[PDB]
Each structure stands twice: as C-alpha cells, then as structure tokens.
C-alpha cells in the first residue's frame, strides 16, 4: 500500500513530527518507550484479556518497574500509557485503549506525544505535553508502520478495525 510505510523492525529512532507510528505488538509487555531526559519518561504497556488486579514487572528504560495492572475485558487487549515526570518519581497510568485488532499508534506533534484511547471500534486520540519533544528518541519493541498525520483518519480506521 502507498498509504502505509513498512513494516519496520523493533528499533531505537527519532521519528519526524506529524507521522503516526502504527504499532503491531504480539505478546503482553512493553510496546514502546521514549524520553526527553528532562521531565517526561513515557511508555505504553500491553495487557492480555482476563487479568485480575496484579503486580507485574516491566523493563522500562533498563529498569525493573512494578506496576499494578488489570484487564477486566475477556475479548479485548488493553494498552496503557505510563508516565513519570522526574527521574526518581513514579509512573502513573493514563489513556487506556481497549483493542480488538491489537494495534496502537503514537505521534510527535505540536510539542506533544499523541496516542489512542477508548474502546475499539470507537477509539479517539489523546496527548501528553512534552518538553523539548524533538530530542525524544523512541524504542519500539514490536514491528511498526509509518503513516502521515494527513492520513490520520486512515490510522484511526486501522486502530479501530485492523489492517
Ligand atoms: C496537562 O494536561 C494534559 C497534557 O497536556 O499533557 C492534557 C491531556 O489531555 C492528558 N492526557 C491524558 O490523560 C491521556 O491522553 C495529559 C496527561 O494527563 C498528563 O500529561 C500526564 O502527566 O495531561
Ligand atoms: Na492511550
């Protein structure tokens, strides 16, 4: 397709602004992480269906981090954005996406990091204001595609219905 660049392999990269990174994860764990090394350490974790409240250890920026997670859905996987604002602080959970297609997306735009939230097939976007956002390197731990912001409606379609 001429709309979607990829797939590309798990890697560390500094994406251009105004491009969605469409992520295609497999198993539960850390999907993608990125930081500005100032006041924003961001990551997205993935929870399989049917997970009772439990502590799980995630490797975030080379560190074992214990987070209290759950997924009450029996059919949908759960993407959760995690954020800490100081090097020595705690991660809080934001902007969950309950997903049937198991796809996620992230984008750098207007001094923010955008992601998807809600429940498929009616997902919407959300964002996190990020200092010096151009320095933000990301490490994807799964295969990904690239889609221009101009084609955001198609990205939303993929989030909601799959490829
Ligand atoms: C300050 O306000 C904002 C932000 O502009 O960043 C608004 C944004 O909607 C919100 N997004 C969501 O909650 C989910 O997308 C985000 C977030 O709560 C914090 O950045 C977490 O530190 O806060
Ligand atoms: Na989200």
Curated annotation (Swiss-Prot):
Per its database record, what is this protein's job?
Forms the head of the spikes and mediates the recognition of specific host cell surface glycans. It is the viral hemagglutinin and an important target of neutralizing antibodies. In sialic acid-dependent strains, VP8* binds to host cell sialic acid, most probably a ganglioside, providing the initial contact. In some other strains, VP8* mediates the attachment to histo-blood group antigens (HBGAs) for viral entry.
Q: Which organism is it from?
A: Rotavirus A (isolate RVA/Pig/Australia/CRW-8/1987/G3P9[7])
Query: Which residues lie within the region annotated Spike head?
Result: 4-163
Q: Can you say what this protein is called?
A: Outer capsid protein VP8*
Site (described: Binding to sialic acid): 40, 129
Q: Which cysteine pairs are covalently linked by disulfides here?
A: 142-155
Full-sequence portion shown in this chain? 64 to 224 of 776
Compartments (UniProt record): Virion
């Amino acid at each position: 397709g001429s709309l979607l660049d990829g797939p590309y392999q798990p890697t560390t990269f500094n994406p251009p602004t105004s491009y969605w990174i469409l992520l295609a994860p497999t198993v539960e764990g850390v999907v993608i992480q990125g930081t500005n090394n100032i006041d924003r350490w961001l990551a997205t974790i993935l929870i399989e269906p049917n997970v009772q409240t439990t502590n799980r250890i995630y490797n975030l920026f080379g560190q074992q981090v214990t987070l209290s997670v759950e997924n009450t859905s029996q059919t949908q996987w759960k993407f959760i954005d995690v954020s800490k604002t100081t090097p020595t602080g705690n991660y809080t959970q934001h902007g969950s996406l309950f997903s049937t297609p198991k796809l996620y997306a992230v984008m750098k735009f207007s001094g923010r990091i955008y992601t998807y939230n809600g429940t498929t097939p009616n997902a919407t976007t959300g964002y996190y204001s990020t200092t010096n956002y151009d320095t933000v390197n990301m490490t994807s731990f799964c295969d990904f595609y690239i889609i221009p912001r101009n084609q955001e409606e198609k990205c939303t379609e993929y989030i909601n219905h799959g490829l």
